[PDB]
Amino acid sequence: GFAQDKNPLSTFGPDLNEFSRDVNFLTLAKNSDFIYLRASGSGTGKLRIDNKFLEFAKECRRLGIPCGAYHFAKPSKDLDSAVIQADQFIDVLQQGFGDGDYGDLFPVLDVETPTDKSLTTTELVNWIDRFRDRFEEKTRRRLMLYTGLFFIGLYDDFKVPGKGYPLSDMPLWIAMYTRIPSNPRIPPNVGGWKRWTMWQFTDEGKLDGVGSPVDLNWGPNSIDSLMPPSAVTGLNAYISGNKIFVNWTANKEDDLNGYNVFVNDNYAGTLPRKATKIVIDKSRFYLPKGKPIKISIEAFDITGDFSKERTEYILDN
Amino acid sequence: QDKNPLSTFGPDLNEFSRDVNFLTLAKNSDFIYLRASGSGTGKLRIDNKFLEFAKECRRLGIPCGAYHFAKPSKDLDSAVIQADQFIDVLQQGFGDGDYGDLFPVLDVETPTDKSLTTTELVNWIDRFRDRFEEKTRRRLMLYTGLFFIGLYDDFKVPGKGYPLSDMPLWIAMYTRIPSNPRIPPNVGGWKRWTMWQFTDEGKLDGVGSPVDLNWGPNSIDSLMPPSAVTGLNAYISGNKIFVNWTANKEDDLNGYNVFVNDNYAGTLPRKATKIVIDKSRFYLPKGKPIKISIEAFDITGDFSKERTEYILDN
Ligand SMILES: [Mg+2]
Ligand SMILES: [Mg+2]
């Protein structure tokens, strides 16, 4: 087996909730690459919005601090509750970040329960997987999974009989605290996950800008790897002959993986990460003579998030 | 960037290669490039062995690609024409609608006298590339030499940066030339080379004559489009379509596009094996079959040659 340490480029930031004391976001803006907030949770037996989420998320956005949020899961044998909780989380996220906006960072499902024997590994993973399917279908945003190394170990490494590791394609935020002497020094490779995306290495950290002992995390080498890419800039198009010539400024994200281009919302092609142009054959589209033509584009990154908005260029035609 | 334990390896051949034994090459080469055509003489010529060599590589399952010996000029129409000609010849060798297993290659080695500006040369290559990729939906790789790049100002175009730096680069730099560095230097705005022709005088079992030899990417897949997706399945439940497939296995896999009756339904990342589609987003009459189709794509933007389909009866 092998393991994955942090490195000099690793990003860093806390996660917080309504019980975090004395949080000065202006101070955190100077020392944190990102902040995670609790949005909601069902740990008490019903859905509760975190009582500081709206305030915390508004101030992080105001200060330009990359901000994401998590839902504390209550899994069960009834898979309808995964759909309900996913829908509730989707609703709360928009309350915090805006209509149709689910945060700067990956939305997170926080799974820490149950730790008795009440669910089989198949039942627990099926519940998470259903939550993931609903969440991503509804938002077009990737969902990151938070859980602890101990918890994974209680559930057989999240290995499902007959099915391998169904959650191993989720981004992983793994908790393994170095303050526990029996823990390894760095996160081992587990659950079929090739890599961790974030590592929560303490629940008792000291960081200027949070008064209470705080959860601290290592992240990817680039903040871009936690966020969707930005909208494309410099979009331009012209018609010559029977072709539409489209060009744009290259997106700059470290995790950029390509672009999709559309003509009147019909797909026109997929380009790789270094691309800055496409030539489109007009005959493939119903383009009434004299009517305007909408060219639009989205970037997407390695883990499959897209530009929140599609930059547009209207050809008068 | 040097070669390394994973680097692929293979010759490039043309009609002047002597005593070629493809059975031997199938055991010692990851890939073979062939000359398809050239325009150096002022007229399109087809390499006299290309069809024979391509057929034998396909018969033995040797990954096979081909190149066009360019004749750049100040006349940009000639770039469109040579691209269209290269497109035709490739299909003669590889089959209708088939442009080879490996990146098709534009081979640029002329002119070396003072007869073209850097802007003119780069614009010609760029126009060939645009026409070729537009017509084939296949990425074009550029072959050229380190000396040639230096001759044309590092392919830096005044006011335009390095317009060719997004092309895969097959760079020739012969270690037998003492003034050359021992590994390719960074040039032309290219972050990396895709292939490195390191000799024109190599000795390779299965080729009788001194032969061009090349280091390629760490994975043969990085020279080829991804395979068609397999294991595609779909069903309807409620107002949704649940689609799943087997994961493609290419080392350079980058994702999938899924379509509903040829309409775009989404892009998935490389580890994905399912998508849930809301029927409400597509025109889906009761009693009309629904075509689900999918393609894989790789990091440099080539696609599965065919889309795998699954027909739902609805
Ligand atoms: Mg990203
Ligand atoms: Mg490939």
Side-chain angles (χ1 to χ4, degrees), chain A residues 1-290 292-317, chain B:
Chain A
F2 287 78
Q4 175 189 341
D5 200 348
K6 59 90 62 178
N7 70 83
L9 297 173
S10 295
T11 53
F12 166 90
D15 56 274
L16 309 170
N17 62 27
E18 69 183 81
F19 309 116
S20 300
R21 303 189 294 283
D22 304 352
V23 177
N24 187 330
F25 287 101
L26 189 59
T27 301
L28 291 178
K30 296 297 131 273
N31 62 24
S32 302
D33 298 293
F34 57 81
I35 297 169
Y36 264 106
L37 312 170
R38 183 168 74 166
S40 54
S42 298
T44 71
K46 74 168 197 215
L47 191 288
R48 294 177 164 187
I49 186 167
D50 175 284
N51 289 306
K52 290 285 197 182
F53 173 56
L54 300 181
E55 168 185 344
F56 281 179
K58 191 174 192 179
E59 183 67 1
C60 284
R61 277 281 172 85
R62 192 184 69 78
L63 294 174
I65 305 170
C67 185
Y70 64 82
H71 172 73
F72 184 93
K74 195 163 186 71
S76 82
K77 298 185 193 185
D78 176 14
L79 294 177
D80 293 339
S81 66
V83 176
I84 289 164
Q85 284 175 51
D87 284 351
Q88 289 166 333
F89 185 36
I90 288 166
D91 177 3
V92 174
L93 286 163
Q94 294 174 94
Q95 298 184 38
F97 293 116
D99 288 340
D101 189 327
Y102 307 99
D104 309 317
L105 324 171
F106 295 115
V108 164
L109 180 71
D110 167 6
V111 180
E112 293 170 52
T113 193
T115 57
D116 56 9
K117 300 227 289 294
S118 58
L119 298 180
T120 71
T121 300
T122 301
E123 289 170 324
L124 178 61
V125 170
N126 281 356
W127 189 96
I128 298 171
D129 203 21
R130 171 65 58 91
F131 187 107
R132 177 259 291 268
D133 287 346
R134 182 65 164 200
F135 187 86
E136 297 194 337
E137 175 227 310
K138 288 284 177 179
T139 67
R140 208 192 185 200
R141 291 289 299 272
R142 298 300 315 275
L143 181 67
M144 175 151 70
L145 180 69
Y146 169 101
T147 192
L149 182 56
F150 178 81
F151 191 85
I152 289 171
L154 278 176
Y155 282 96
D156 291 303
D157 211 27
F158 282 4
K159 186 170 190 187
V160 173
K163 298 289 181 65
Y165 299 95
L167 309 176
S168 64
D169 68 319
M170 301 185 71
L172 177 65
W173 178 5
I174 190 169
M176 184 200 75
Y177 300 163
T178 55
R179 73 166 171 82
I180 297 165
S182 72
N183 273 339
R185 177 183 64 82
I186 53 171
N189 289 338
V190 295
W193 276 291
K194 305 289 194 46
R195 292 173 58 73
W196 54 259
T197 296
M198 293 183 28
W199 168 23
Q200 193 183 70
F201 63 90
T202 183
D203 58 344
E204 296 186 327
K206 176 184 189 280
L207 185 60
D208 282 1
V210 180
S212 40
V214 63
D215 296 346
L216 298 175
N217 305 281
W218 302 115
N221 290 1
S222 178
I223 184 69
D224 301 337
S225 294
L226 294 177
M227 306 189 301
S230 299
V232 176
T233 70
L235 183 63
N236 181 57
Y238 67 86
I239 297 186
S240 184
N242 210 44
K243 295 161 172 19
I244 308 170
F245 293 79
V246 186
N247 74 286
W248 55 90
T249 301
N251 267 55
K252 314 293 175 211
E253 289 86 10
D254 301 307
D255 64 340
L256 182 69
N257 221 11
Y259 313 83
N260 292 322
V261 176
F262 302 86
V263 175
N264 296 331
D265 299 325
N266 300 112
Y267 169 83
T270 302
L271 297 308
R273 64 186 67 176
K274 292 180 175 51
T276 62
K277 60 181 168 175
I278 186 178
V279 187
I280 300 174
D281 190 325
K282 282 170 73 175
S283 67
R284 292 186 187 169
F285 306 89
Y286 300 123
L287 300 176
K289 157 179 164 158
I293 298 167
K294 185 177 65 161
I295 305 296
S296 59
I297 191 172
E298 65 193 7
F300 57 86
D301 64 15
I302 292 172
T303 44
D305 282 309
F306 308 86
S307 304
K308 187 179 182 284
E309 309 297 350
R310 292 186 178 165
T311 302
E312 297 177 359
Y313 186 95
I314 307 304
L315 297 151
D316 284 331
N317 190 42
Chain B
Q1 174 193 351
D2 202 352
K3 61 85 65 211
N4 66 74
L6 289 171
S7 297
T8 48
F9 166 88
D12 55 270
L13 312 173
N14 65 20
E15 64 177 86
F16 305 115
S17 304
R18 298 148 90 117
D19 304 318
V20 184
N21 183 332
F22 288 100
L23 293 181
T24 309
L25 292 174
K27 297 189 198 175
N28 67 23
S29 299
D30 299 283
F31 59 81
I32 294 172
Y33 262 105
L34 315 173
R35 186 171 75 168
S37 54
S39 304
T41 67
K43 159 189 180 221
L44 191 281
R45 291 294 291 279
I46 298 176
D47 178 283
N48 284 129
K49 288 289 190 183
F50 168 51
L51 301 189
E52 170 184 344
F53 285 179
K55 179 172 171 129
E56 183 68 355
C57 287
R58 280 278 172 81
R59 184 182 75 82
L60 301 170
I62 310 172
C64 188
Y67 62 84
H68 172 73
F69 179 95
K71 194 176 193 300
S73 80
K74 301 176 198 277
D75 178 28
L76 291 176
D77 298 342
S78 70
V80 169
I81 289 166
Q82 285 178 42
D84 284 352
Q85 290 175 321
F86 183 39
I87 288 162
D88 274 357
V89 176
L90 286 166
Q91 298 174 86
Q92 292 179 32
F94 293 118
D96 285 346
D98 193 322
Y99 305 103
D101 309 313
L102 319 171
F103 296 114
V105 163
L106 178 67
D107 165 14
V108 180
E109 295 168 38
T110 67
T112 56
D113 70 336
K114 190 63 177 184
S115 60
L116 279 183
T117 74
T118 296
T119 296
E120 285 168 342
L121 172 73
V122 168
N123 284 343
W124 190 99
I125 294 171
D126 199 22
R127 172 66 72 85
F128 186 111
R129 172 263 291 272
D130 286 353
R131 176 66 164 205
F132 188 90
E133 296 191 343
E134 172 220 323
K135 287 286 179 174
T136 64
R137 206 189 188 202
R138 286 289 300 269
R139 290 306 309 276
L140 181 72
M141 173 156 69
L142 177 71
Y143 167 97
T144 194
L146 180 65
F147 173 84
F148 194 85
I149 292 170
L151 188 66
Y152 283 95
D153 300 325
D154 208 36
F155 284 3
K156 182 175 192 297
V157 173
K160 301 285 186 166
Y162 304 90
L164 306 181
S165 68
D166 66 325
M167 299 185 70
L169 172 67
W170 177 4
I171 190 167
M173 182 199 76
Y174 299 161
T175 56
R176 73 167 168 76
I177 292 170
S179 65
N180 275 343
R182 295 303 87 192
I183 64 169
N186 164 273
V187 294
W190 277 292
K191 305 294 188 50
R192 293 167 52 81
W193 49 267
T194 298
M195 294 195 4
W196 169 20
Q197 194 180 72
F198 61 87
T199 184
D200 57 350
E201 299 181 335
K203 302 176 193 163
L204 181 55
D205 258 17
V207 183
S209 43
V211 69
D212 296 338
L213 299 177
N214 305 280
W215 298 115
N218 296 359
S219 176
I220 185 64
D221 302 329
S222 290
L223 291 175
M224 309 189 297
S227 296
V229 177
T230 68
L232 181 64
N233 178 61
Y235 65 95
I236 297 179
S237 188
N239 211 36
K240 299 184 160 58
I241 305 168
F242 294 79
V243 184
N244 70 291
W245 54 90
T246 301
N248 270 58
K249 317 204 149 73
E250 289 87 9
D251 301 313
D252 65 336
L253 183 61
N254 221 11
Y256 310 83
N257 292 318
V258 174
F259 305 82
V260 174
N261 299 321
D262 296 328
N263 299 294
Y264 174 78
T267 304
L268 295 312
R270 65 183 67 168
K271 294 177 173 50
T273 60
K274 55 184 174 166
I275 188 178
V276 180
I277 301 169
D278 190 327
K279 287 174 73 184
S280 83
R281 295 204 285 269
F282 298 89
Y283 181 56
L284 302 174
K286 184 184 56 158
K288 188 185 182 173
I290 305 168
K291 178 170 79 154
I292 307 295
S293 61
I294 189 173
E295 64 191 9
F297 56 91
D298 60 25
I299 285 171
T300 47
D302 279 309
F303 304 90
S304 307
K305 185 187 168 52
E306 311 292 344
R307 290 186 182 164
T308 304
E309 303 173 357
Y310 187 103
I311 308 304
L312 289 163
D313 285 329
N314 203 36

